[PDB]
C-alpha cells in the first residue's frame, strides 16, 4: 500500500 | 502552494505558520464537523502533495481518524494505479500521494503542458477520506431527527439540515428526505401546518408558516 | 480574488485564512444582523464564484438559513437562464453559481473584453438571499417599535432606524415611515415636542429638541 | 435546480 | 485605496479585513469620542467613495447617528450640486457620494489630469457629518467644566481640553476660552496661583505652578 | 436627496 | 529561508518573529509530542543551517533534551565526515551543522549546480535527534496499551495509534502490531467482535463493528 | 512613510492600522514613560508631517499633555521661522508642521536634491515636546532617590537609572550624578562597600560587590 | 534591516512594530534568561546600528542592566579604536555604535566592496554585554546544582544544563563539568548507576539508565 | 502660532 | 566614552 | 565533536 499504519503521511517508502 | 519566482520560473511557496496553526485550530476544535472539509479545502488551495502531507502530519491528535484517512488514501491510490497503468513520466499513485514524488516532480506535473494536477488529484483522495471520517463522527442518521414537542421550527430545521449535510445518501435521496422526512418528523401542530401548505412548499414558506405555532 | 501574476497574466488569488476566519467569526457572532450583508460584501471584494462558494461552505452552522439562501440562488439562477437564452461561450446560471464553471472559465469571463462579471453577478444573488434571511431573522416590523415611557429619545431613534434598516419596504415607504411612524410612536412628551417642530424637521433637529425631555 | 438541498455550494452536478 | 497594478495601470486595492475590523472596533468601543474622526481619517487614507461607503455600511450599530451622518451628506452633496453646475464628465454630488458613480469612474477621476479627488471630497463630507455627531454625543459644553475642590490641576486641564476639543466654536473663541475659562473655573487656590502668573502664562508654566497646590 | 433614510450608504438610486 | 533579491541574485530571508514565536509556543506547549517533528519541519521549510540553529537556540527550556539533540548531531555529523572524505569546496559535517560554514557558504551550496542541500541535510540530522527525544519522552510502549473495560473503542484506537506513532519499530513490526496487538488488547466483548470479523478487517470496519458494543 | 511606486516615482505609504493601534496602545498604557519617546521614534520611521500629525491626532486622551506638546511645536516652529528667513520654495515652520504644506509638498522636499527632511525636522520638534512632557510626568528628581534600608542594590540601581533617564540635566551633570549620588544615597552597608571600591568603579563591579550585602 | 529598493539601490527597511513589540515582550517576560541572546540575535538579523539602538532604547525597564550593557559597549568600542587606528572613511568605534555614523554611512559600509559589516560588529558588542548581564542575572553557579533526593533525573539534567548554559567557563571546563559534576552531584542511587555505566556514557545512555531509579 | 489650543495637529489655518 | 550613563543608545555626542 | 555540551547550536569552534 501507499501509506502504512504507523507511518507519517508522505513518508518515502523503504 | 506554487508561485512565479522573481527569476521567472515556477517555484514552491511554503505554508505560512498562520495557515498551519489555523488547520491545527480547526481540527482540534471542530473535530470533523462537516464544515472541516470546506475549511480544509480552502486552507489547501493550490497545495502540492508535500503541502497537503505537511498539513495532515501536523494534526497530531485523532490518530484513529487519521488512520481511517490513510486506509482511504491506500484504496484510492491503488484504484488510480488500476485505472492508469504505467507506460515527464506519468505519476503513480505513490507519486500523487507525495511519497515517491519529489517536490520538484510535483511542481513539474502541476505546471506541465497540459498540466497533471497531482495536488488536486491527491486533495480529492484526502477529501474523500475526510468524508468517511465525517460520517462516522456523526452520531445520528437523518432518520433519527425529530422535532422537540416545543422546539422552535427554525431550530428543528437547523438540526435537520445540519444532519442531512453529513448523511451520505445520494442526491435524489436527499431530495426525498427534505421533501418527506422534514414534514413527517415535525411536531404535530407544525406538521399539520406543513401538510396544509401542500407538498411543493419552499423552505422559506414552510418556516414563515410554522413560525406562527 | 484575481491578480496579475509575475508572468504577466491574470491568475487567481486564494482566500486568506484571516478572511475566512473573519467570515466565520462574523456569521457565528452576528447571526444575520443586517450589517452581515455589507460585511460579507467587503470580505468578498473581487471574489470569483469559487471564492464565494468557499465562503458559504465554510459557515457550517445556521443550515436552515443556508438552505433559504440556496432556494434563493435556485430561483435567481433560473431567472438568469430565462432572461439570457443560450446561443468564450455565454455563462448559464449554473456557470455563474460556480457549479458547471471551472475556476479558469470564471477568470476568463471576469477578464473578457468586455468582461462578463460572473463573480459580481453571483454575489448579487447571494446578497439577495442574505436579504431574505435578514428579514426572517428580524423579530419585529417597524410598526411594532414604540418608545419606552422613559426611554431616551436617542435610544428610541437607534431602535427605530436599526429596525427600519431590516424592513423591506420600498424606498418611498421608508420615507413615509421615517416622517410619520418616528413621530407617531414617540413617548407623549417627546411626541408633543416633535409635532411642535413641524413635519419637515431633520433628525438632528428632532434629537436636539427631544433631548430636552 | 442549480443547488440541491443537501449539497454544498459550488458542488458540480452529477 | 488605489494602487498601480503589475500590468502598469491604476487599479483598486480592496479594504483589508483588519482595516474593516479595526473600524468596527473603533466605532463600537469609542462611540464617537472626538478621536474617532482622526482614527476614521487614518483608516480611510486614499479611500475611494466605494471604500468609504463600505466602512460606513459596516458600522451596524448607532443607526440614529448614522442617519444624522446621512442628513449631513444629503445637504453637503446638494451644496456641491449648487456650487458646481453641470456642463470625463464632471461628477455630481451623487457621483462623489459613490451612488451614481461606478468604482471605475471613481478611480478615473482620482487619477485624472489634473485629478478630481472624489474620494477626498466625499471624505470631507463624512468627516463633517462625524463632527456634528461628535458634538451631539458630547454631554457638556466647555462652560460647564469646573475643577473639583480637590481635583489635581493636571486632571482638570485634561477634562477641560478634552471638552474644548469637542466644542465647536470658532478658533478665536477657543483662544479666549483657553485664556479665560481655564483660569476662571479652577479651584480657588489654583485659581489664585494662575492669576498671580499673569494672563500670558503658557500651559506648561500654569501646570508647573499649580502642581504646588 | 443623495442618501435616503433607510438605505445603506452608496446605494445606487432607483 | 532563501529568496531571489530584486537585484537578481539569491539572498537570505530572515526568520519572521511569528515563525520563531510559533516554534517557541510549539516546543513550550507540546513538549516533544510526535507532532512536534512535522511542525518543526513545516516551520523550517527551506531553512539554511543558520536558520535551523536560530530556531534551536531560541528554545531555552528542555536543555536536557536539547543536549540529547546535540549528541545526535555529533554522531550524525561524524558519520557524514566518515562517509564523505575531503578532496566550491565540499562541506564537512561542521559546515553542514552551520558552525564552520558562513551563511554565504550555506547559500552558495544550496544554490550550486547541482546544489548541495546543506539545509536539508542538517535538517535530517535535527529531525533524527528529535526522533530520539520523542521516544524517550513517550511514557509507554505500544505493548503497554490495553483498552479500558468500558473505554469506547474509538478512544482505545486513538490511544493505540498515538502510541504506535511514537514507537520506533521498523515498518513490518508496525504492520504486525496494528494487525495483532490492536485486537489482542481490546476489551473482551470488542475483542470477540474483532475476531469475528476475521484477520484482514480494515480499521473502518473494525470501528464500525465495535461501535455496537 | 515614503516608497517607490511601481510606476517608478516616489509616493506616500499610508500608516498601517497596526502601527496606529500600536501607538494608541503605547500612549494609553505607558502614559509618557521615557520609553515612549524611542517607541514613538521607531513607530514614526520615515514619517511625513501628515503621518506624524495622524499619529498625534489619534491619541485622544492626555489632552493637557498634548497641549503642552502643541506649545512646544509653537515655539520650535517660530524659532525655525526666525533662524530661516524666507527668500521648490523653502518650507516655513507651518510647512514643516504639516499645516500649510500639502502631502505632495512634504514628499517633494523629502525627495529633493539635496533633500530637505521636513519629516525628520518636525519629528525633532515633536520629540522635544515629548521630552518636556516626560519630565513633568516624572514624579521625582534623581536627588529624591534613596535606597530602601533592605532594598536589593540591583533594585535601587534600577530605580536610580530609570529616574536619571528622565532627569534633564546636561550630560556632565549626569556623569557627576552616576558617580556621586549613586554612592551617596545607598544604604549604609552597601554605601560602605562602594566607598571601599574607590571612586572609579564600574557599575558591574559596584553591583558584584554590593550583591554580597 | 537593509533591502534593495524598487529604484535599484540599497535602502533601509524600518523595524516592524511586531518586531519591536516582540523584543519588548521578550525582555519584559524573560528578564535575561540566556535564551534572550539568541532571541535578540534572531530579531536583529541584518540590523544596522540605528536599528539595534532602536531596539535597545525601546526596553524601558531593567535600566541597571542596560547601563551594564553601555559599560560593555564603552570598553568594546574603545578596544576597537585601539585595535584599528585611523588612517569611504574607516569607521571609529562611535561610528559602529551608531552615534557618530548617519544611517546612510551605516548602509554605505554594510554595502561597501568589500563590505564593512558595522551592523554585525556592533551586534557582537551588544551580545557580549548581554552575556555579562546573563551571568549576573543567573542566581547559581553550576557547582551549586545538586539533584533533589527524589527529583527525577531528567529534571536534574534540565536544571544542570540550563545552569551550564549560563556558566561562563571556557569550553574545556564545560566538558569537564558535564563529565564530572553531572555524575558527582546526582542522588546516591542514580549516582551509583551512572558510575556503573563508566565515564564515557552519553547523556542518552545516562538518562535511559537512571530513569529506572 | 502654528498650532492653536483647541485645534487638531496638522489643521490647516483659516 | 562612546555611550555615557544617562544617555539613550545611539545618542549623537555633543 | 561538532557541537560541545554547553555551547549554543551553530557556535563557531575555537
Numbering used by the authors:
A (entry chain B), D (entry chain B), F (entry chain B), J (entry chain B), K (entry chain B), L (entry chain B): 313 to 326
B (entry chain A), C (entry chain A), E (entry chain A), G (entry chain A), H (entry chain A), I (entry chain A): 1 to 87, 96 to 221
Lines from the paper:
pmcThe mature HIV-1 capsid is a conical, fullerene shell that encompasses the viral genome. It is constructed of a lattice of approximately 200 capsid protein (CA) hexamers incorporating CA pentamers at 12 highly curved vertices. The surface of the conical capsid is dense in protein-binding sites that mediate interactions with host machinery necessary for transport of the capsid through the cytoplasm into the nucleus. Here, we present structures at 2.6 to 3.5 Å resolution of CA hexamers and pentamers within in vitro assembled conical CA-IP6 polyhedra from multiple lattice contexts differing in local curvature and geometry, alone or in the presence of Nup153-, CPSF6-, or Sec24C-derived peptides.
